[PDB]
Amino acid sequence: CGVPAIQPVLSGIVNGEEAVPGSWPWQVSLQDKTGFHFCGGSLINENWVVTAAHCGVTTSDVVVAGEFDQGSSSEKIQKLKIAKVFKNSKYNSLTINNDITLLKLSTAASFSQTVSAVCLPSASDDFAAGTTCVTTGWGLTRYNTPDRLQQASLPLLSNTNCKKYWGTKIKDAMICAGASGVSSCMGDSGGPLVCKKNGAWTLVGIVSWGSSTCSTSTPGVYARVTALVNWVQQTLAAN
Amino acid sequence: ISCEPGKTFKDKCNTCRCGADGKSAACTLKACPN
């Protein structure tokens, strides 16, 4: 996991840049019956996708893998149906805490050079503040919806420094990043925030919430995967 | 933007919590059909 067949190129979502096609193989798009993209997500293995609980995904939605340009019709993509939705029981819709949902596919995904899985961290893993990580998505680039997958590098913050911005809204199951020139925005929800650990890209955050105006001077908020991995493991082990 | 401080209102398809100054707010980042 975490090693894309097509190596990504970073020259270092608002103020991001266009990514190399197929360089973020675990990035999927969640679409409704009409084909409307409403949230992002990440493949963790052939049968499962992880995304945000607030996205409100149902077994009537579709997972699209291997995509780059959403306006194109000549890409070799995979439209996968959803078997079951597993929302985290501790999700609080008022505080947006424990913002994580698992999707069991009704048909396994076919791995290739444009479709593969991202690695999951260990609950004890240490991702230090200041580390430069990456977030990707098809969300707004300006307050303008992009056709092509965007990417951005940004530093993780410590929850103590994030509280200076959001106060009591920052819970332990949350991690912040940004406030450095770029910003997650509408349409990015459920997408990944990845950092490289021992050579492999690892999922450390899931786009959750932030500035209503996608300010590039305010840190974005993501669900902290290390505080949620045990739940993921239990769910997988039981299904 | 202008909203009731601390109040949890709902934008299009996203939900938000008005800033402690009624001048801003924090919202989820979903894409809405409208």
Task: Give a quick rundown of the structure.
Chain A is mainly β. In chain A, 7% of the residues lie in helices and 33% in strands. The relative contact order of chain A is 0.22.
Textual characterization of the structure:
The complex is a heterodimer of chains A (239) and B (34). Chain A is 7% helix and 33% strand. Chain A is mainly beta. Chain A has helices spanning 159-166, 229-237; strands spanning 17-18, 27-31, 37-43, 48-51, 62-65, 78-87, 101-105, 132-137, 150-155, 174-178, 192-197, 200-211, 219-224. In chain A, a hairpin with a 7-residue loop joins strand 12 (200-211) and strand 13 (219-224). Chain A has two helices and 13 strands; from the N terminus they run βββββββββαββββα. With 34 residues, chain B is mainly beta. Chain B contains no helices and three strands. Chain B has strands at residues 8-10, 15-18, 25-28. In chain B, strands 1-2-3 form a three-stranded antiparallel beta sheet, with no helix packed on it.
Task: Summarize this structure as a short list of keywords or feature phrases.
heterodimer, A: Thrombin, subunit H, Thrombin, subunit H, seven-stranded antiparallel sheet, globular, B: 34 residues, three-stranded antiparallel sheet, elongated
